[PDB]
């Protein structure tokens, strides 16, 4: 779940400056007026867009060493392939 | 018991202790990894380096390991010596050469001794441009998770699991920079005290799976002293 | 399921009688089983441990530390070439290239027939006679890229 | 020089070598004054007297460092309660460029057996272990046959020479690691443990093999003992006039006309060994540099060829005597690729105990490989130099790395131009992230 209370938000961009994944981004939009304050509480359904946003081509998972579907151990950037301790090479 | 001189200031410490233990107990901050208050001193990571002078007139001392050096009376040491600071930062840099970029997705973030020492040594710039070593992980049962990529080879786990808890299923395998710490084969750690590894390991190789399911950072936890 | 042969068991036991702690026989115990199997099968680690009364993790650590102890299958005749500096000046690189061509493999792997395994080794203590190589337990000195094809034939 | 006549007094360690290069066995060994020094010591001199004689002789270690064997034997505990003691022979010889031990063990096995027998009596040791590398197949069979022959003759076993001294000798074969050569690592390897070095103090003298008083000595060091207890201390002191008393198996290798090793007194200049014995560089090759004694020694130039082969002379020159087995580098050899080979060895022979040696040496190998491939970037030589200073004595847990940076620092010192040709690319460890303007450090 991801919840942002825009009733308290001051739009400072400290959170966007803090991501190591360029996921959270403040976009050029200013029209968010509401009738009930409870509707100023946005969830992931009201936050997750369908594109990369201001940062066009950055994938933290291509830099991380943690294996995921698609990237196995040794398949990240600047990463060597796992060498078994039972290898015969000295 | 003994009088030592750290960075000019004089301190009264127990001569039976090592300079690391003594200075840490004085409130002085020296980076460390391989040493543990309960597992003793081994002198592996070479991180607790301090410059030691023979007397008060010595201006060209030597870099020694505070954990492997007695807090003897008449000891002149400097933690702020430039060479000591440079060497201590270099040790962290060498450990960062093959360290994975997985802070955001590791369960030790905000509770990691390695993160604390990197910052304490003031190492924020990378010069290494070559490849980082990788290791495949193992299944260690339903309580402890394995992520060998985040290892720094301090040997704390094997010294606690085997020399303190007397376990027989954890070990160090391989040689040189391909040293691996885990079980001889995939399976559940059999020690009834295997959980202490999560706090013993200074990195995120051993983590708590019971928490990983609903993981939250240390700063977001409400804690209370309980029995 | 790996099972130590009676001969191997007796060999390890004899070694244990030459030292105070039975653990001191671990290195040789790994070499005995290897001499009879070509390498140390994964099952051997536990079996050797039961004979020496030491944690299997300890036996595995020794095996994965010492290079000559093989924890991965190897060919019938292992070929070890000196890659040290004296032999580097003498020209081991040519010998390595010759071996790679005649065998169509690279350092660290076995041939399809499973007859040879090309592994680099450190100094072999014979630089005055380099380049140097060891096939099986036989040492070969004054190596020349032209003699490689013939030398390998001897190890049918 | 070309035809060296070997008289027992001038060549105490090689005068018995046969021309057929076959192993001299008990009968032949005793014919050439064999086990006489043992007889004199076991039945005549007290254990303490033997120690004093070796100390007076000035027998220094021939395994690398020149520590007094007698002093080392004298630092042994004086507690009678500590009855169980051990003597360990460092037969392991994996330092690239060294082959002296093979000659003695494979051709003169009884010489080592006798040296250990006398040395054990002095150290009051009941068991002795020859830590031999596995690659030495012949030495193993030869030493084992020698021990069997000696036991039959009653030189090893119980009540040796009717003295009541009981000594059992065992040959331990190794499994490939070079670190096992380090004294404390040898003890750990002997106990069937990963050959990770130990820390001193405590020193192996009080608590070594299985926590028992232990003494580690090189094959050559032990093979020098028999002659001292047979020909006398005075003879050994007058063998030469150098501060380093005694003879040493010295030699030269590396594209020289006659590569090999020769028993020579300390003081023989490297020039003599290179020209009189090695026969000079092979026709068509010019001398560029030379390592005094091992892959872990600092490179010296032609100007240092007139320096005597002693521990102090080479040290002042800026290197170490080491094993005294020198290696010659010709002009056709690139220093960067040579040091890359040295580092690749030193880096993979690391045991992985301390960060400086485990993660620092691998970095250097990558920089050297980049330099030899023309992919060097500015700052590479500085990192190499910083590594050499931060992997120096005291910083690492043992002396594997301190000696691994000795060749590197020297090559950069005398042949920097070769390391500079490598840097051909601009420095860059960061790619360009779109959307983020980079901090342009100037
Ligand atoms: C990395 C390393 C490798 C060594 N290898 C050997 C070796 O192969 N043979 C040897 O005799 N000493 C070797 N040594 C030195 C031993 O630790 C020790 O000094 C020697 O066995 C005793 O010397 P001595 O008895 O001749 O005085 C090595 C030392 C280091 C640091
Ligand atoms: S940090 Fe982000 S969520 Fe918090 S007030 Fe600033 S812009 Fe809003
Ligand atoms: S172990 Fe510490 S430094 Fe390493 S990725 Fe995890 S949190 Fe970051
Ligand atoms: S797993 Fe943890 S305790 Fe063990 S060597 Fe690695 S960092 Fe140290
Ligand atoms: S210097 Fe350190 S890492 Fe290298 S062999 Fe010695 S103890 Fe091991
Ligand atoms: S904490 Fe002192 S050497 Fe590691
Ligand atoms: S370098 Fe090849 S035998 Fe020494």
PDB file of C-alpha atoms in Angstrom, chain D residues 36-54 118 121-122 124 163 225-226 228-233:
ATOM      1  CA  UNK D  36      78.925 -38.509  12.308  1.00  0.00           C
ATOM      2  CA  UNK D  37      77.673 -35.089  13.510  1.00  0.00           C
ATOM      3  CA  UNK D  38      74.555 -36.813  14.895  1.00  0.00           C
ATOM      4  CA  UNK D  39      76.699 -39.417  16.717  1.00  0.00           C
ATOM      5  CA  UNK D  40      78.962 -36.687  18.204  1.00  0.00           C
ATOM      6  CA  UNK D  41      75.943 -34.587  19.319  1.00  0.00           C
ATOM      7  CA  UNK D  42      73.566 -37.356  20.526  1.00  0.00           C
ATOM      8  CA  UNK D  43      76.419 -39.103  22.410  1.00  0.00           C
ATOM      9  CA  UNK D  44      78.662 -36.261  23.618  1.00  0.00           C
ATOM     10  CA  UNK D  45      77.075 -32.774  23.577  1.00  0.00           C
ATOM     11  CA  UNK D  46      74.160 -31.756  25.876  1.00  0.00           C
ATOM     12  CA  UNK D  47      70.965 -30.441  24.179  1.00  0.00           C
ATOM     13  CA  UNK D  48      71.857 -26.927  25.450  1.00  0.00           C
ATOM     14  CA  UNK D  49      75.483 -27.212  24.185  1.00  0.00           C
ATOM     15  CA  UNK D  50      74.232 -28.074  20.645  1.00  0.00           C
ATOM     16  CA  UNK D  51      71.987 -24.938  20.712  1.00  0.00           C
ATOM     17  CA  UNK D  52      74.982 -22.784  21.829  1.00  0.00           C
ATOM     18  CA  UNK D  53      77.219 -24.220  19.050  1.00  0.00           C
ATOM     19  CA  UNK D  54      74.619 -23.474  16.291  1.00  0.00           C
ATOM     20  CA  UNK D 118      70.452 -33.435  15.706  1.00  0.00           C
ATOM     21  CA  UNK D 121      67.786 -33.538  20.328  1.00  0.00           C
ATOM     22  CA  UNK D 122      68.736 -29.880  20.922  1.00  0.00           C
ATOM     23  CA  UNK D 124      64.124 -31.964  23.057  1.00  0.00           C
ATOM     24  CA  UNK D 163      71.021 -42.547  24.048  1.00  0.00           C
ATOM     25  CA  UNK D 225      73.317 -28.367  11.001  1.00  0.00           C
ATOM     26  CA  UNK D 226      74.979 -31.794  10.274  1.00  0.00           C
ATOM     27  CA  UNK D 228      78.489 -27.827  11.963  1.00  0.00           C
ATOM     28  CA  UNK D 229      78.279 -30.740  14.480  1.00  0.00           C
ATOM     29  CA  UNK D 230      80.776 -32.780  12.371  1.00  0.00           C
ATOM     30  CA  UNK D 231      83.388 -30.218  11.193  1.00  0.00           C
ATOM     31  CA  UNK D 232      83.142 -27.873  14.221  1.00  0.00           C
ATOM     32  CA  UNK D 233      81.878 -24.295  14.816  1.00  0.00           C
TER      33      UNK D 233
END
